[PDB]
Symmetry: C4
Subunit: 30 residues, 4 copies
């Protein structure tokens, strides 16, 4: 099921953005 | 093979959650 | 839509590379 | 193209494992 698949890809993308922002906090990038 | 593909996406999602939790530990978010 | 899907996968890949480079900065790998 | 797609997913998975190991280094998990 391609919608299920796309759903998981979109979820991963959002988590990945949130991860990058958290590292920007540790690094002092803003 | 779409099951193989979905399998890898699900695996990536779980690793990504585990990564976000580990950074929450470094950041002091709980 | 497979192009939309591929688009999101490529985006995730680029964010993931950028994340790995940022951690290389925290770790002192260069 | 599904092979191209699977190729990128596998690449992301490998980068994600490498990212988790790097954080294990910052956290002192071994």
């Amino acid at each position: 099921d391609e919608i299920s698949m796309m759903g998981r890809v979109v979820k991963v993308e959002k988590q990945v953005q949130s991860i990058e922002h958290k590292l920007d906090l540790l690094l002092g990038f803003y």
